[PDB]
Curated annotation (Swiss-Prot), chains A, B:
Active site positions: Q279
Gene3D superfamilies, per database record: 1.20.5.4570, UbiD C-terminal domain-like
Residues the entry annotates as binding prenylated FMN: N165, W166, S167, I168, A169, R170, Q187, H188, E230, K388
EC annotation from Swiss-Prot or TrEMBL: 4.1.1.102
InterPro entries cross-referenced by the UniProt entry: FDC-like, UbiD, UbiD-like_C, UbiD-like_N, UbiD_Rift_dom
Name of the molecule in the record: Ferulic acid decarboxylase 1
HAMAP family given in the database record: UbiD_FDC (MF_01983)
Record text on cofactor binding: Binds 1 prenylated FMN per subunit.
Catalytic activity: (E)-4-coumarate + H(+) = 4-vinylphenol + CO2; (E)-cinnamate + H(+) = styrene + CO2; (E)-ferulate + H(+) = 2-methoxy-4-vinylphenol + CO2
Function: Catalyzes the reversible decarboxylation of aromatic carboxylic acids like ferulic acid, p-coumaric acid or cinnamic acid, producing the corresponding vinyl derivatives 4-vinylphenol, 4-vinylguaiacol, and styrene, respectively, which play the role of aroma metabolites.
Keywords: Cytoplasm, Decarboxylase, Flavoprotein, FMN, Lyase, Manganese, Metal-binding
Quaternary data: Homodimer. May form higher order oligomers.
Biological source species: Aspergillus niger (strain ATCC MYA-4892 / CBS 513.88 / FGSC A1513)
Length: 500, 500
């Protein structure tokens, strides 16, 4: 099967790419696997495949770390991500985000039900597993549990059957047959849970599938609109209907080639201790345990030689930056365009710990609006910060056409030189905040509200008559034929490859 | 003579270091020399020495570009700068800034007058030169003049004789015997000029020396206190009295080994067109000419085979970042300590285009103050933004002890994750602003006032009981013996030198 449609095939692709290291000697899931993965993420090294995991029994489980992290070269920086989507490994971020947005103006392609698949090769009933006996990793030394769920997809359906959501939310082992995890507004797993709690009759039928089709885990990490079933969006994006099998113990459907599937229920009444967890902004607050959602596991099914993907998340760069930030930015780009804002591109700079999004403005269009910074900032911030797609983002940076928002250096340059602190900014205190950012949930103000800003790095003439500067750089401050002379004589004079 | 005390010796040092490229074929001062230098600066390449400059006559002049710019390796990144100061080329920024601050608590060592020196090898009187006939560079394609003065030292003395200031301020050729340049508050050349204008009797006796002792050009770029004669500070810093010769046409004293010296007057009455100039924040506004100060040149003296240093300034990284930013930060560190603020380190991140300074706080000391963010931000900002040393800096970022302020990645991480926009910041509108920043002089508000902010990236417990997190990074989220195991097995498992 194609790599974008089958996780097992994606692992092969990474090998062929010379983007995998297979560790075949014993590795401890207590911290060692995650430490190796952390190091990989901080150095943009090859993804680790742990084929000999201390505590692996009867097929459960191998681990692949860093499945969506960066490669060291510039030329295929985003190659792992491209491999989730059938794109060339040299794809740019713009190309990846355009692929992720392409289904937004296409008819869904609903999934196809098949009678079986590899995810049914093995099964364990409710007398035959114990989640505390599996080789679940301790990912960070101070975590409050062993986080089984860092790169699987939760599957829940609205009570009326009309919306089936796929999303990544963290979860850890609570006891032999339960997990606890985050289920928080405005996330779709939380919106669906609230519909079941208002109905009041039963717990939420649930499945958690690990090692799903890569294109599916991408959509699972993207804030596509409310009410949109991710399976049909992925179908449209890939041009193919996804093959799903029914769960054995409920009527949800899981990808046929899922590596591991948990089936059970998400409680509408019970909670349990959850966290702390080393998280996307780079922090853990040891001892900061709070009540989270509680999941009951009734059944495990799995592939022979099952592989569990794992995100060892924290400081730059891992899946929580490459996927959460970039995919939110993509959705924000579209949302702004659909609100008639002249935005061409959006990206969450890694340097901001994906808490900022830079919005590239089509300044010819802006000029025709005959508006001002204050009015335009307010308009942009009202659209983004009042929408779910803006949830994780606390600073928007508006930049003109000369800035490549996918280059953090250039965003930082524009922000630092074109946005006057205070005057060129609008603060938003009466919007939903992202409590996971340290300065929110561990900060001086309300954990769930405010703390957001639009920073206008458009210069005044960009609103009126046009850009009135040139950069003092090699590109802009020298004529073309001089530039080319310099480059052609560079190594001849004595001074110092694109792939590497 | 030692490299730190003689520019000609500094050029040799750079050669021996394998940090020079000698271009011996003809190079045009109209843009070509500056384009090559710009490229060097943007790529951290070797400094260019242009030994065959089209228009060089009777010894005037060769050019050295990029004299204070960065080297490519991490291990000797700041080596050019270290070579200005007799420090090892592997010196850290902390070590360089400590050297620059060391004279602040030492008695001055006043200069020594000698009867002659190399700067007297050649002379041109007021019938024998023409500044428009010298090979003065056009540095950026849209500059409003040919900027002869980008790395020389202006010498002016208070009317009472008690303070002789050395400083870098830009100047360009106006006509055969005049320059125009910036002379703006609160700079010491401007403070001294105002004293001569209040006296009202004559123009300011002036000299401009190019290719001065490297330790002297460092102090010239540093905001040492009002009334302090840079020559005696450099003497104290280096442990040696600097040798100076008298000018021929006035009673000022210039370094004996200066490459080129202009003697004349700075007018107390006349101005002339100045600018625009491609500047330290990375911009030029073509056509933005304004009236600047006017200098009359009466005499040129120079060394045989004189070398003019040149800064091709603009986007990262050149002398306007490495010297202006870092040396302001150094002075700000000291100023805060002298005001009883618990600051250990200060640096202007390059990523901020040297418009920010990050202040590392001794949080044990902070805790003993029993204060709050609002009060501490206000106190820090009042000290810094009301002082000349804070002139160029528009954002202060307060960080705790875990942050290395000399690492821009870490500053950006702390700012983005620990400072809640608005709530954790104090804006300062009633302080002097730096008009050169685009968002000031070309922005929405007053060019000369306000636009400054203190951003507190200290977390709440840093004021009370102590840091209450660990980073989710390899260093902090794994025990020492695991970490060392991982590193020792790294290349064995399959994964990927300090000098490179
Ligand atoms: C890629 C990725 C995404 C997420 C997470 C992780 C990864 C690797 C963890 C490592 C597990 C860490 C955790 O913080 N995490 C996570 C999470 N969203 C949550 O509500 N809860 C979480 O615990 N998202 C973000 C989301 O997946 C998206 O916000 C998505 O848009 C949700 O889908 P939907 O609600 O829009 O359908
Ligand atoms: C290293 C360096 C410093 C400066 C400059 C340059 C370099 C390379 C130019 C390339 C020439 C560009 C120009 O913008 N420039 C410059 C300038 N200060 C000015 O008032 N005017 C200027 O035109 N400084 C900054 C200063 O030299 C300091 O602020 C110093 O502190 C002044 O000394 P003092 O007043 O404290 O004695
Ligand atoms: K989703
Ligand atoms: K602006
Ligand atoms: K000075
Ligand atoms: K703070
Ligand atoms: Mn959804
Ligand atoms: Mn001075």
């Amino acid at each position: 099967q194609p790599a974008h449609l089958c996780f097992r095939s994606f692992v092969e692709a990474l090998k062929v790419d010379n983007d995998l290291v297979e560790i075949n000697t014993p590795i401890d899931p207590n911290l060692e696997a995650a430490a190796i993965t952390r190091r990989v993420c901080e150095t943009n090294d090859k993804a680790p495949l742990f084929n000999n995991l201390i505590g692996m029994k009867n097929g459960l489980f191998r681990i692949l770390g860093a499945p969506g992290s960066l490669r060291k070269s510039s030329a295929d920086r985003y190659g792992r991500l491209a491999r989730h989507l059938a794109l060339p490994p040299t794809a740019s971020m713009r190309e990846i985000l355009d692929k992720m947005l392409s289904a937004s103006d296409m008819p869904p392609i609903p999934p196809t039900i098949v009678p079986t698949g590899p995810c049914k090769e093995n099964s364990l009933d409710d007398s035959e597993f114990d989640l505390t006996e599996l080789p679940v990793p301790l990912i960070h030394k101070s975590d409050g549990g062993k986080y089984i769920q860092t790169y699987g997809m939760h599957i829940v359906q609205s009570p009326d059957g009309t919306w089936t959501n796929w999303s990544i939310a963290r979860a850890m082992v609570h006891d032999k047959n339960h997990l606890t995890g985050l289920v928080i507004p405005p996330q779709h797993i939380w919106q669906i849970h609230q519909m079941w709690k208002k109905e009041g009759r039963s717990d939420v039928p649930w499945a958690l599938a690990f090692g799903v089709p890569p294109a599916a885990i991408m959509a699972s990490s993207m804030p596509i609109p409310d009410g949109v079933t991710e399976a049909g969006y992925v179908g449209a994006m890939t041009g193919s209907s996804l093959e799903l099998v029914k769960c054995d113990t409920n009527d949800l459907y899981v990808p046929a080639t899922s590596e591991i599937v948990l089936e059970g229920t998400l409680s509408i009444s019970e909670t349990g201790p959850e966290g702390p967890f080393g998280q996307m902004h780079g922090y853990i607050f040891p001892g900061d345990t709070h009540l989270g959602a509680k999941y009951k596991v009734n059944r495990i099914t799995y592939r022979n030689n099952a592989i569990m993907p794992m995100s060892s998340c924290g400081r730059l760069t891992d899946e929580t930056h490459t996927m959460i930030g970039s995919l939110a930015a993509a959705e924000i780009r579209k949302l702004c365009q659909q609100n008639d804002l002249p935005i061409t591109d959006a990206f969450a700079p890694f340097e901001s710990q994906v808490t900022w999004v830079a919005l590239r403005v089509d300044t010819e269009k802006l000029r025709a609006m005959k508006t001002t910074s204050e009015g335009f900032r307010k308009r942009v911030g009202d659209v983004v910060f009042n929408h779910k797609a803006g949830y994780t983002i606390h600073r928007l940076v508006l930049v003109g056409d000369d800035i490549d928002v996918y280059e953090g250096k250039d965003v930082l340059w524009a922000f630092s030189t074109r946005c006057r602190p205070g005057m060129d900014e609008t603060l938003f205190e009466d919007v939903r905040g992202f409590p996971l950012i340290p300065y929110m949930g561990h900060g001086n103000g309300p954990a769930h509200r405010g703390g957001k800003v639009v920073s206008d790095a458009l210069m005044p003439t960009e609103y009126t008559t046009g850009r009135n500067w040139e950069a003092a750089d090699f590109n802009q401050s020298y004529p073309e034929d001089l530039k080319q002379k310099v480059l052609d004589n560079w190594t001849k004079m004595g001074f110092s490859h694109h792939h590497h």
